[model samples]
Target: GSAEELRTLLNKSNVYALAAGSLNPYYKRTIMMNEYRAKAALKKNDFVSMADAKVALEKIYKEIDEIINR
Candidate 1:
C-alpha cells in the first residue's frame, strides 16, 4: 500500500505518528533525516540518499512528541 494509505489507516485507528513505517513517502520528512545523518557523520551534509533523510525526519518527529509530552 501507499504511504498515504497507511497514514489514513493509522489515523482511523487513533494511532500516533509513530504508527508510520520505517520510511514515509513524505519528501519533507526525508529531507530532514538526510540532513541530520550527514551532520552526524561529519560529512559534507548534502544528504547522500533520500532514505537517510527519511530516517532523520522520523527521529525528529518522535523526539518532538516526547518533548511536548514532558
Candidate 2:
C-alpha cells in the first residue's frame, strides 16, 4: 500500500502547495520541490526514493497540521 498511501500524501501535498494548506514561503517552495521529487520517483516506480520523500512529506505534513490546529 506504499504507492497508494504515497499517492494520497502526494495529493495532499499538491493541494497544500497550491493552497489547501499554507506555509512559510521557504517551506512552500521547498515542499513543492520535494513534491516534484516524489512525483518523479513515483512515476519511475522508484520506490526507494519515493519512500524517502514519503517519510519526509508525511512527517512534515503531519506536524504542520498539528501546528495549525493547535
Best by TM-score: 2
Put down candidate 1 lDDT per residue, 3-43, tens digits, no spaces. Answer: 33323322332233344333354533444444445444434
> How would you encode candidate 2's per-residue C-alpha lDDT over 1-70 as one tens digit per residue?
6788788888788666655346567657767877888888889999888888899887777766776688
Off by over 4 Å in 2: 18-22
Q: Where is the poorest 10-residue window by lDDT in model 2?
A: 14-23
RMSD of 1: 12.0
Clashes of 2: 0
lDDT scores in order = 0.42, 0.77
**Candidate 1, run of 10 with poorest lDDT:** 5-14
Candidate 1: residue pairs that collide: 30-54, 33-53, 33-56, 33-57, 34-53
